[PDB]
């Protein structure tokens, strides 16, 4: 595809209908040094004259999915700063409401991220649980959760014997539980990684009723010697190509428009 507008149209042609977006942003400490190779030794959260990988990924996916979003409300959260660690998420909206469109998401991000104290450890369980709660509150409307992160979930420091860390186990569990909801999870890897362990994380996830999880390496696509519009389109397509199939599975499995009655009831903290 030549542009993300063509990708948008292709997703519609493949059967995507009303679709909602939730954004989760990794604000752990390693963002300060994982742009060594891929972002000119700047922090991946550096706010400067050109967009950082978080801003770019949000812009591209936000634009691609915008026409499917009826209410244009985009819940947006951070995780891994000093206020949340691996236990919570915080809202990027400072007015106790949801952002109106991806452009406002980007404004909130720019406003808040220089005020954060980047921390750890890294877990995706809180953001996935918040997404489940949002889906349940919506009465089972279809959602895409976009997680943007610069590292896999925190590993055990016992590199000889230590199996799954609490972060790994809780994140895997959340992915499994999430598959009871009409929810697609897209993990976008930014920065240097490494990202060559994702295929094994995928094997470590128990079988689910539908494949609700996908990973895309943003850095590997966006570094290519390719026309920028085409490159952005390649990223959008690589991130979202399974979404129409997953949406169909939520129909087949009787998830769309249905409530479980037992969601995490996870509440976000306000922004620092
Ligand atoms: Cl709220
Ligand atoms: Cl909220």
Curated annotation (Swiss-Prot):
One of its GO terms (molecular function) is zinc ion binding. One of its GO terms (cellular component) is plasma membrane. Keywords: Abscisic acid signaling pathway, Cell membrane, Lipoprotein, Membrane, Metal-binding, Myristate, Transferase, Ubl conjugation pathway, Zinc, Zinc-finger. Its main location: membrane. GO terms for biological process: abscisic acid-activated signaling pathway; positive regulation of abscisic acid-activated signaling pathway. Its EC number is 2.3.2.27. It is found in: Cell membrane. N-myristoylated. It comes from the Eukaryota. Residues 20-240 form the VWFA domain. It is a lipid-anchor. It catalyses: S-ubiquitinyl-[E2 ubiquitin-conjugating enzyme]-L-cysteine + [acceptor protein]-L-lysine = [E2 ubiquitin-conjugating enzyme]-L-cysteine + N(6)-ubiquitinyl-[acceptor protein]-L-lysine. Together with RGLG1, mediates the ubiquitination and subsequent proteasomal degradation of the target protein PP2CA. Functions as a positive regulator of abscisic acid (ABA) signaling through ABA-dependent degradation of PP2CA, a major inhibitor of ABA signaling. Interacts with PP2CA. This is E3 ubiquitin-protein ligase RGLG5. The chain holds residues 74 to 345 of 433 of the full protein.
